[PDB]
Amino acid sequence: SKYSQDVLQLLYKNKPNYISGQSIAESLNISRTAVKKVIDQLKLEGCKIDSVNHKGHLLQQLPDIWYQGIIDQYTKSSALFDFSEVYDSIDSTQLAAKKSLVGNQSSFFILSDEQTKGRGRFNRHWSSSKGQGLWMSVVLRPNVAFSMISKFNLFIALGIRDAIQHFSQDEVKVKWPNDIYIDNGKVCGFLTEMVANNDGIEAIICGIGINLTQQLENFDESIRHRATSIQLHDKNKLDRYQFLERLLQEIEKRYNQFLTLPFSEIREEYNAASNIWNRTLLFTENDKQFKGQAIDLDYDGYLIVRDEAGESHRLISADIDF
Amino acid sequence: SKYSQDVLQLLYKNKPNYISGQSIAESLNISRTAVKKVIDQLKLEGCKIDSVNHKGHLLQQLPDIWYQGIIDQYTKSSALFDFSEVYDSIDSTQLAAKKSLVGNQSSFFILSDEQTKGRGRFNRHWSSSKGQGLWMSVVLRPNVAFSMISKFNLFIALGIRDAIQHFSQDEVKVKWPNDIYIDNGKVCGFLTEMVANNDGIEAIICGIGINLTQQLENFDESIRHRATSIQLHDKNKLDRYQFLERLLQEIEKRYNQFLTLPFSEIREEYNAASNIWNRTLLFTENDKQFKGQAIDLDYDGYLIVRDEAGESHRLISADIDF
Ligand SMILES: O=C(O)CCCC[C@@H]1SC[C@@H]2NC(=O)N[C@@H]21
Ligand SMILES: O=C(O)CCCC[C@@H]1SC[C@@H]2NC(=O)N[C@@H]21
Structure with a gap:
């Protein structure tokens, strides 16, 4: 439905309070009954929404699926990223990025619930399964010399490790230059690419895959022992939105360090983290x-x-x- | 018209002989009179086509405008480039390239008769006037380390200089790292960019502008003394297609040197050419x-x-x- 997202946005934007059928209806300017329709659908998609008569509606929990509307409430409040693009299914978040960044200077990122032609280093195949992991590309615009690429990777790596770690009960280490492990499980791979030219960088494109909700039964034969999802290491359920929040928080943090530090300043820290x-x-x-x-x-x-x-x-x- | 190009292609493909109304008509499978229509239009666009009764049609000279059909007869016969894209008008040949090269490995190039948002180093403004210059981007796929970018530039530069020179009566020199001059006239600027990542290069995108047919009356106030077109240095008319041919010939040649030589092997030569x-x-x-x-x-x-x-x-x- 045309307004499903606008409705979601009002719900999220309004925690931890209820809002009425009527309240919302006024804001989007559509019949209250058009709202009931939206909500019942949202519920039916697996949203936990508390509806009490006279009080209204409280968004409690979201599904393992990405909603543009709620992500917008992230890019708004962000002073790194301009905007974002959210997809159910897609060739690659990276491909998409490498397209969307031409002829502009936007900093932005792209999420998909599933990739069909998702790829890792060396045009390797990367399994991007519907609603199971964070499949995201991230375009940044740091004006530095092209040589500086490799330094970025190092910083981000810790960023990524940290975010993941805040949710793991087990040791999240890094396997230079691009892999984040937990014990022996690749929990995440990540690829740093760039468009650049002698005179510096046009853009940095960091592609990140992080396994979220997999059970060993989900991994192909060819890998089942050296892959692990964040969920196999968290006691509670892992809220894909809660995680995303920390992850950007961290990706950011780490990026400014990248921009205002040498490598040495994090060198030892990085060491203590490698496996x-x-x-x-x-x-x-x-x-x-x-x-x-x-x-x-x-x-x-x-x-x-x-x-x-x-x-x-x-x-x-x-x-x-x- | 739908077949204007197919018709052109038959004409060019058939020099230095005539081909009949009927001959062609059979090949594209359309009425002979549909052919007369095409030709009269082509003529009317400024093609020199000799039509003799009983003998048929001979393509003599083409306009200062680019035709896909005839360019195809270039990419076919080429063992560097897969394909090409030809445009009357366009944001940028570079932009276009940076788009068209995502999610594939094609080597190809792109021509426009005019750019609207044509740009040089440093997001500078580059005047790309209808039917006056070669405004072309060139995507290549040399598997080498990203650091090698700068070396490419050096090789190409001579390539570009040489092609231009074969048509100038005056000294074509290079002004490292990116400008080709004739006496004091920038005849051409050229920009080498790349998409890459630690593990080597995804693609090289060389944007080249070369002033062809300008008279000093054509250049803005802000530049009129340090800009010159190839035509101000050639006694005869400069055939934009004749030139293109040599230029690719040369761009190629120079690229393989790039791939199988050190810089030293052309170093002195490059020196003798700088101004x-x-x-x-x-x-x-x-x-x-x-x-x-x-x-x-x-x-x-x-x-x-x-x-x-x-x-x-x-x-x-x-x-x-x-
Ligand atoms: O090869 C690796 O070790 C890690 C590869 C990174 C995969 C990320 S998932 C987001 C994205 N989109 C892509 O097309 N590849 C990736
Ligand atoms: O800045 C310079 O000195 C030279 C710039 C190169 C211009 C070429 S023309 C082909 C093309 N398309 C672009 O958008 N820029 C260029």
């Missing part, structure tokens, strides 16, 4: 493949690694498996 | 502005410059004025 140490690693380099021990992250965000032949490298990136 | 030496230069650096002498291009494509206080810098880029 790549003292264990053997399987690096892969188009054609080439080999092993090695991760020995340190230098001031500059490079991984220093003693390979299996005692030979010492400095990598800005890498493709690592355990 | 930045032994003259004072006005560098500009957001807020800062200062002077200096260009003293050398190092093996790595960096400009070495003695500034006005004897202080020595290595720039990968710069913003320079005379």
